[PDB]
Structures are given as C-alpha cells and as structure tokens.
Amino acid sequence: IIDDFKVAVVTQPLSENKVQYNMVEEMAKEYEEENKIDKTKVKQTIKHVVLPENFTSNIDSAINKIVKLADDKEVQAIVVSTDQAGLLPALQKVKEKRPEIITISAPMGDDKNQLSQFVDVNLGVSAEERGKVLAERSKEMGAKAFIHYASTDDLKDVNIAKRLEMIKETCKNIGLPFVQVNTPNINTEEDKNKVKQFLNEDIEKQVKKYGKDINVFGVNEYMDEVILTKALELKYIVAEQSNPSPIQTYPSVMGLKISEKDAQNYDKINDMISEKAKAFGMSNRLGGYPMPMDAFLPSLAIYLATEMVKQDLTQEDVCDPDYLEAFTELRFGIGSEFTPLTEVLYNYQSVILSQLIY
C-alpha cells in the first residue's frame, strides 16, 4: 500500500503567470474532490509553492523555497513550471537529499542538456519544431504567402530566431512564399502605437499584393491583437497566435467576456470563439491548440507525477513518445506529438498539440 502523498508544484505568482498559477489551483481542487471518495484509493494532494516575485533577482530565496520541500516526508514528486532559468541547482540539491522524489520540468528555462542530466522528466517546446508545424498548418489552410512580423530586438531572442529560421526553411520546402517584415523596436510605451500603425499599414499592403489568402503571424500578444483584429476586416488567415491561447487576446478581439470561473474552461472558450468566427465570416481562417501550452505542460506533468508515484514508475517507463501521446489521449482527449531532444536524451520530450481550427 503506497503511502498518501504530495505532488509539489512550483510556479511564479498569480501577478506574473496567471495561467500556470490558476491551473495548479484548479488541479489542487480536483484532487481534493477525488480524495472525498473513499473507494481503497491512495490519496494525493497538490502542494502549490509560489516563487518570489522577480525570482531571478531573488534567486537564493527561490532556491531555498524549493529545497525545503525535501523535509516534508509526504512530498513524493516536484514539478517546476517557469520559462525562466535559475532553479536547476534547487532540484539537484533535492535529489541528493531525497533520491526517490520524482522531479519534472514543465517547463524550466535552463539549458536543455543540463535539464536532461539533472531532472528526471523534462517537458517543453522546441522552437524549431514549432516553426515547421506552423508553416505546414498555414499551407494546409490555403495560405499563398506567410508574413512574419518581429522587431530586430525580438530577433535577439534565441527561440524567436530559431522558429523564424525553421518557418523560412519549411516554407521553402513546401512552396509557400515567405515574407519577413521588421517591425519597430519597442523601447517605450509610445512605441507600441507606432508598432500598431506600422502593422496595420503593412498588412493592408500584403493583402493587396497577394489577395486575402495569406497567413499573418506575429511574435507577441500585442502583435496578435492587432493581427487578429485586422483579420476580421480583411479576412485573411491567422493559423496561430505567437503562442496559441484561447484565453489571451481572443476574448477581447471576438467580443467575449470570460468569467473568472470559466477562465480555465478551454473547451467552452473554444466553442464561444467558433460561434463568433462563424458569425464574422471567419470559419476555417483562425487556428490554435485545444489549450495553451502554459496550461497543458503543468497539468500533464502533475498527472504524470501522480501516475508515476501510484505505479512506482521511473523516467525510463514514461519518457517515450508513444507512451506520452497515449497518456495525453487518456487524460485530455486530445492528439499530440512528442519528440525526444536527442535519441540518447530520451528524458527530454518536446510536444506540439493537435491543431484546432475555429
């Protein structure tokens, strides 16, 4: 009989990462409800650990906060979810004190090779593979050109650069004209309205050149807003936001009001977006995923940790694309594709979710 256990989940605070924070809280409540039904079931709860604000500037307090979890005898797994780097030493120290604690990045911002060496299960996104799939999904939706918008400062970000490179290469392989357009650098808030004006004028130009069957893509939520808004008028294609999310940007663009209680009900949000898309003459023009990656990775990691503790599994048992795809169908009812970092670094798996078209 496996002891009742805790799955500790580390996120940034609500003020910084609302989606991650609230998904963990939601899963906590789910597990509380499960624990009310006696049959005998093993009991699991989530311990939500909140990092200090601006944690990279308060790195020792953030690290210490995690390492203390090792003192709690009931903690049997630790999941860490942040796009930022710095917390890896914390998980090394936990593992040295408590070898049996299952550690999972979902995601972490640290070097991916280091993550593979020192953390048991690693889940993330590959900018390269994202680029390839976004180019293909654009093609499948009937795009006759792909317009990519980003500032030269944006292109300093290694993942933005890498995704761009793979979109361009993929577009070349599949005969999709690719157009790269440099947007003004955003150094102050004043620059935002300059970016908005720039985008509006350039998009009009691109539609005059190619006609409306082009895909338009930007690299942040502010661009996504301008792009989706203009799409309603010119009726072009937006295969994906910078990062696909039903809850970010879509609700304001489509004129939806999502209650605090529905904020994590992604299926209901998606139905609401499709109704508006139908009403606005935009069916089969707008895409995404069934849920944002900021919600999926930590929710998948929690379910995996729980299964691993209940079934006494280790990284070798679960870190396999077929296993993780089937488990995703089981727990979410969605399709996915998982790819190892390298054939040898099997315990780092990147994921792309199946397409949703509104």
Q: Determine the residue type at 164.
A: L
Please state the three-class secondary structure of 199-218 as a single string.
HHHHHHHHHHHHCCCCEEEE
Q: Are 282 and 358 in contact (CB under 8 A)?
A: yes
Long-range contacts made by residues 173-177, C-beta under 8 angstroms, separation at least 24?
A: 174/135, 174/136, 174/139, 176/135, 176/138, 176/139, 176/143, 176/144, 176/145, 176/146, 177/144, 177/145, 177/146, 177/210
The span from the CA of 9 to the CA of 77, in Å, is 8
Q: Please, is 40 exposed, middle or buried when counting C-beta atoms within 10 Å of its C-beta (0-12, 13-18, 19+)?
A: exposed
Q: Which residues contact 271 (CB under 8 A, 6 or more apart)?
A: none
How many Å from the N-terminal Cα to the C-terminal Cα in the chain?
46
The span from the CA of 235 to the CA of 233, in Å, is 6
Sheet with 5-11, side-by-side order of all strands: 44-50, 5-11, 75-81, 102-105, 121-124, 348-353, 336-340
Residue 7: φ, ψ to 5°: -105, 110
Residue 107: asked if its preceding bond is cis (omega within 30°), the reply is yes
Residue 238: φ, ψ to 5°: -130, 90
Taking CA atoms, 282 is separated from 67, 248, 276, in Å, by: 50, 19, 8
Helices 293-311 and 18-34 cross at an angle (nearest 10°) of 30
Which among 237, 266, 83, 216 has a CA at the least distance from the CA of 157? 83
The neighbour count for residue 197, using CB atoms within 10 Å, is 12
Q: Are 256 and 273 in contact (CB under 8 A)?
A: yes
The neighbour count for residue 32, using CB atoms within 10 Å, is 12
Please state the three-class secondary structure of the chain as a single string.
CCCCEEEEEEECCCCCCHHHHHHHHHHHHHHHHHCCCCCCCCCEEEEEEECCCCHHHHHHHHHHHHHHHHHCCCEEEEEEECCCCCCHHHHHHHHHHCCCCEEEECCCCCCHHHHHHHCCEEEECCHHHHHHHHHHHHHHCCCCCEEEEEECCHHHCHHHHHHHHHHHHHHHHCCCCEEEEEECCCCCCHHHHHHHHHHHHHHHHHHHHHCCCCEEEECCHHHHHHHHHHHHHHCCEECCCCCCCCCCCHHHHHCCCCCHHHCCCHHHHHHHHHHHHHHCCCCCCEEECCCCHHHHHHHHHHHHHHHHHHHCCCHHHHCCHHHHHHHHHHHHCCCEEEEECCCCCCCEEEEEECCEEC
The neighbour count for residue 112, using CB atoms within 10 Å, is 19
Q: Determine the residue type at 338.
A: F
Domains of the chain: 1-125+294-313 (3.40.50.11400), 126-292 (3.40.50.11390), 314-358 (3.30.30.130)
Two tokens at 147?
Answer: 């317009």
Taking CA atoms, 325 is separated from 105, 112, 126, 318, in Å, by: 18, 21, 16, 10
Q: Determine the residue type at 186.
A: I
Q: Which residues contact 37 (CB under 8 A, 6 or more apart)?
A: none
Q: Determine the residue type at 156.
A: K
Two tokens at 89?
Answer: 């030493």
The span from the CA of 270 to the CA of 276, in Å, is 10
**Residue at token pair 């070798």:** 316
Q: From which experimental method does this structure derive?
A: X-ray
The span from the CA of 159 to the CA of 214, in Å, is 24
Which among 131, 108, 130, 132 has a CA at the least distance from the CA of 119? 108
Two tokens at 211?
Answer: 């006609």
